[PDB]
């Protein structure tokens, strides 16, 4: 269910464009995962 | 995109897509699956 640190690092670039061009709780979450690394 | 990584992140990405800007939701789904 949960996503680990390793995966968050991997996804970083792919998720990036969508993340900033988005909002809500989930957008904020993913942002935190990649950023805080 | 991946076998493992795809399935892992994608569910989260869909939740994000619900309230994204412009029409980013489309892009999310395109890469991902359900």
GROMACS .gro file of N, CA and C in nm:
model
  213
    1UNK      N    1   0.083  -0.121   0.000
    1UNK     CA    2   0.000   0.000   0.000
    1UNK      C    3   0.086   0.126   0.000
    2UNK      N    4   0.164   0.140   0.108
    2UNK     CA    5   0.255   0.255   0.124
    2UNK      C    6   0.370   0.251   0.022
    3UNK      N    7   0.422   0.371  -0.006
    3UNK     CA    8   0.537   0.386  -0.097
    3UNK      C    9   0.664   0.418  -0.017
    4UNK      N   10   0.774   0.345  -0.040
    4UNK     CA   11   0.901   0.366   0.033
    4UNK      C   12   0.984   0.482  -0.022
    5UNK      N   13   1.089   0.514   0.055
    5UNK     CA   14   1.182   0.623   0.020
    5UNK      C   15   1.242   0.605  -0.120
    6UNK      N   16   1.288   0.482  -0.145
    6UNK     CA   17   1.351   0.445  -0.274
    6UNK      C   18   1.263   0.482  -0.394
    7UNK      N   19   1.137   0.439  -0.388
    7UNK     CA   20   1.040   0.469  -0.496
    7UNK      C   21   1.020   0.620  -0.515
    8UNK      N   22   1.006   0.692  -0.404
    8UNK     CA   23   0.991   0.839  -0.409
    8UNK      C   24   1.105   0.909  -0.485
    9UNK      N   25   1.227   0.860  -0.462
    9UNK     CA   26   1.346   0.909  -0.535
    9UNK      C   27   1.336   0.882  -0.686
   10UNK      N   28   1.296   0.759  -0.718
   10UNK     CA   29   1.283   0.713  -0.858
   10UNK      C   30   1.183   0.797  -0.938
   11UNK      N   31   1.065   0.815  -0.879
   11UNK     CA   32   0.952   0.884  -0.945
   11UNK      C   33   0.977   1.034  -0.966
   12UNK      N   34   1.052   1.095  -0.873
   12UNK     CA   35   1.082   1.240  -0.870
   12UNK      C   36   1.067   1.316  -1.004
   13UNK      N   37   1.146   1.286  -1.108
   13UNK     CA   38   1.141   1.357  -1.237
   13UNK      C   39   1.008   1.340  -1.313
   14UNK      N   40   0.963   1.214  -1.318
   14UNK     CA   41   0.839   1.177  -1.388
   14UNK      C   42   0.716   1.250  -1.331
   15UNK      N   43   0.705   1.244  -1.198
   15UNK     CA   44   0.594   1.309  -1.125
   15UNK      C   45   0.603   1.462  -1.124
   16UNK      N   46   0.726   1.514  -1.130
   16UNK     CA   47   0.755   1.658  -1.119
   16UNK      C   48   0.659   1.749  -1.198
   17UNK      N   49   0.648   1.737  -1.331
   17UNK     CA   50   0.568   1.830  -1.414
   17UNK      C   51   0.422   1.838  -1.370
   18UNK      N   52   0.365   1.720  -1.344
   18UNK     CA   53   0.225   1.710  -1.298
   18UNK      C   54   0.205   1.776  -1.160
   19UNK      N   55   0.300   1.748  -1.070
   19UNK     CA   56   0.289   1.787  -0.928
   19UNK      C   57   0.265   1.938  -0.907
   20UNK      N   58   0.359   2.018  -0.958
   20UNK     CA   59   0.344   2.165  -0.953
   20UNK      C   60   0.220   2.215  -1.027
   21UNK      N   61   0.193   2.151  -1.142
   21UNK     CA   62   0.070   2.179  -1.218
   21UNK      C   63  -0.050   2.098  -1.163
   22UNK      N   64  -0.064   2.104  -1.030
   22UNK     CA   65  -0.173   2.036  -0.959
   22UNK      C   66  -0.192   2.097  -0.819
   23UNK      N   67  -0.294   2.048  -0.749
   23UNK     CA   68  -0.324   2.095  -0.612
   23UNK      C   69  -0.395   1.986  -0.529
   24UNK      N   70  -0.432   2.026  -0.408
   24UNK     CA   71  -0.497   1.934  -0.312
   24UNK      C   72  -0.395   1.862  -0.223
   25UNK      N   73  -0.451   1.780  -0.133
   25UNK     CA   74  -0.372   1.707  -0.032
   25UNK      C   75  -0.266   1.616  -0.093
   26UNK      N   76  -0.308   1.541  -0.195
   26UNK     CA   77  -0.221   1.442  -0.262
   26UNK      C   78  -0.103   1.509  -0.333
   27UNK      N   79  -0.133   1.618  -0.405
   27UNK     CA   80  -0.028   1.697  -0.472
   27UNK      C   81   0.080   1.743  -0.373
   28UNK      N   82   0.033   1.795  -0.260
   28UNK     CA   83   0.121   1.838  -0.149
   28UNK      C   84   0.205   1.722  -0.094
   29UNK      N   85   0.142   1.605  -0.084
   29UNK     CA   86   0.209   1.485  -0.031
   29UNK      C   87   0.330   1.445  -0.116
   30UNK      N   88   0.303   1.413  -0.243
   30UNK     CA   89   0.407   1.370  -0.339
   30UNK      C   90   0.524   1.470  -0.344
   31UNK      N   91   0.487   1.598  -0.349
   31UNK     CA   92   0.584   1.709  -0.344
   31UNK      C   93   0.681   1.694  -0.226
   32UNK      N   94   0.622   1.671  -0.108
   32UNK     CA   95   0.698   1.651   0.016
   32UNK      C   96   0.793   1.531   0.008
   33UNK      N   97   0.744   1.421  -0.051
   33UNK     CA   98   0.822   1.296  -0.058
   33UNK      C   99   0.954   1.313  -0.135
   34UNK      N  100   0.941   1.355  -0.261
   34UNK     CA  101   1.057   1.378  -0.348
   34UNK      C  102   1.150   1.488  -0.294
   35UNK      N  103   1.088   1.601  -0.260
   35UNK     CA  104   1.161   1.721  -0.213
   35UNK      C  105   1.247   1.694  -0.089
   36UNK      N  106   1.178   1.646   0.015
   36UNK     CA  107   1.244   1.606   0.142
   36UNK      C  108   1.323   1.475   0.122
   37UNK      N  109   1.444   1.493   0.070
   37UNK     CA  110   1.532   1.381   0.032
   37UNK      C  111   1.677   1.430   0.018
   38UNK      N  112   0.442   0.304  -1.622
   38UNK     CA  113   0.559   0.288  -1.710
   38UNK      C  114   0.638   0.159  -1.681
   39UNK      N  115   0.674   0.141  -1.553
   39UNK     CA  116   0.745   0.020  -1.507
   39UNK      C  117   0.647  -0.096  -1.485
   40UNK      N  118   0.703  -0.209  -1.442
   40UNK     CA  119   0.621  -0.321  -1.393
   40UNK      C  120   0.578  -0.295  -1.247
   41UNK      N  121   0.679  -0.283  -1.161
   41UNK     CA  122   0.657  -0.258  -1.017
   41UNK      C  123   0.624  -0.111  -0.990
   42UNK      N  124   0.719  -0.024  -1.026
   42UNK     CA  125   0.712   0.120  -0.992
   42UNK      C  126   0.581   0.185  -1.038
   43UNK      N  127   0.541   0.150  -1.160
   43UNK     CA  128   0.414   0.197  -1.219
   43UNK      C  129   0.296   0.176  -1.123
   44UNK      N  130   0.274   0.049  -1.089
   44UNK     CA  131   0.162   0.010  -1.002
   44UNK      C  132   0.168   0.074  -0.863
   45UNK      N  133   0.291   0.098  -0.816
   45UNK     CA  134   0.314   0.159  -0.683
   45UNK      C  135   0.265   0.304  -0.676
   46UNK      N  136   0.320   0.387  -0.765
   46UNK     CA  137   0.294   0.533  -0.763
   46UNK      C  138   0.156   0.571  -0.818
   47UNK      N  139   0.121   0.507  -0.931
   47UNK     CA  140  -0.003   0.537  -1.006
   47UNK      C  141  -0.131   0.558  -0.924
   48UNK      N  142  -0.168   0.472  -0.828
   48UNK     CA  143  -0.289   0.492  -0.745
   48UNK      C  144  -0.290   0.628  -0.674
   49UNK      N  145  -0.174   0.663  -0.618
   49UNK     CA  146  -0.154   0.796  -0.557
   49UNK      C  147  -0.175   0.908  -0.659
   50UNK      N  148  -0.112   0.890  -0.777
   50UNK     CA  149  -0.121   0.989  -0.886
   50UNK      C  150  -0.265   1.017  -0.931
   51UNK      N  151  -0.347   0.912  -0.932
   51UNK     CA  152  -0.490   0.924  -0.966
   51UNK      C  153  -0.564   1.014  -0.867
   52UNK      N  154  -0.537   0.991  -0.739
   52UNK     CA  155  -0.594   1.074  -0.630
   52UNK      C  156  -0.558   1.223  -0.648
   53UNK      N  157  -0.432   1.246  -0.687
   53UNK     CA  158  -0.383   1.381  -0.720
   53UNK      C  159  -0.459   1.442  -0.838
   54UNK      N  160  -0.478   1.359  -0.941
   54UNK     CA  161  -0.542   1.399  -1.068
   54UNK      C  162  -0.681   1.461  -1.048
   55UNK      N  163  -0.750   1.412  -0.944
   55UNK     CA  164  -0.886   1.459  -0.909
   55UNK      C  165  -0.899   1.612  -0.908
   56UNK      N  166  -0.794   1.678  -0.857
   56UNK     CA  167  -0.791   1.825  -0.852
   56UNK      C  168  -0.652   1.879  -0.892
   57UNK      N  169  -0.620   1.858  -1.020
   57UNK     CA  170  -0.501   1.920  -1.081
   57UNK      C  171  -0.536   2.040  -1.170
   58UNK      N  172  -0.431   2.113  -1.208
   58UNK     CA  173  -0.447   2.234  -1.291
   58UNK      C  174  -0.451   2.199  -1.440
   59UNK      N  175  -0.513   2.290  -1.516
   59UNK     CA  176  -0.528   2.276  -1.662
   59UNK      C  177  -0.606   2.150  -1.702
   60UNK      N  178  -0.529   2.043  -1.726
   60UNK     CA  179  -0.584   1.910  -1.757
   60UNK      C  180  -0.474   1.803  -1.742
   61UNK      N  181  -0.398   1.819  -1.634
   61UNK     CA  182  -0.288   1.728  -1.599
   61UNK      C  183  -0.337   1.586  -1.565
   62UNK      N  184  -0.459   1.580  -1.510
   62UNK     CA  185  -0.526   1.452  -1.480
   62UNK      C  186  -0.520   1.353  -1.598
   63UNK      N  187  -0.539   1.409  -1.718
   63UNK     CA  188  -0.532   1.331  -1.843
   63UNK      C  189  -0.395   1.262  -1.859
   64UNK      N  190  -0.289   1.341  -1.840
   64UNK     CA  191  -0.150   1.291  -1.852
   64UNK      C  192  -0.121   1.177  -1.753
   65UNK      N  193  -0.166   1.197  -1.629
   65UNK     CA  194  -0.150   1.096  -1.523
   65UNK      C  195  -0.206   0.960  -1.566
   66UNK      N  196  -0.333   0.962  -1.606
   66UNK     CA  197  -0.405   0.841  -1.649
   66UNK      C  198  -0.340   0.774  -1.771
   67UNK      N  199  -0.293   0.858  -1.863
   67UNK     CA  200  -0.231   0.812  -1.989
   67UNK      C  201  -0.114   0.716  -1.963
   68UNK      N  202  -0.022   0.762  -1.878
   68UNK     CA  203   0.093   0.680  -1.835
   68UNK      C  204   0.047   0.556  -1.756
   69UNK      N  205  -0.033   0.584  -1.653
   69UNK     CA  206  -0.084   0.483  -1.559
   69UNK      C  207  -0.192   0.391  -1.619
   70UNK      N  208  -0.247   0.309  -1.529
   70UNK     CA  209  -0.356   0.215  -1.563
   70UNK      C  210  -0.455   0.200  -1.446
   71UNK      N  211  -0.557   0.118  -1.471
   71UNK     CA  212  -0.663   0.092  -1.370
   71UNK      C  213  -0.748  -0.033  -1.403
   0.00000   0.00000   0.00000
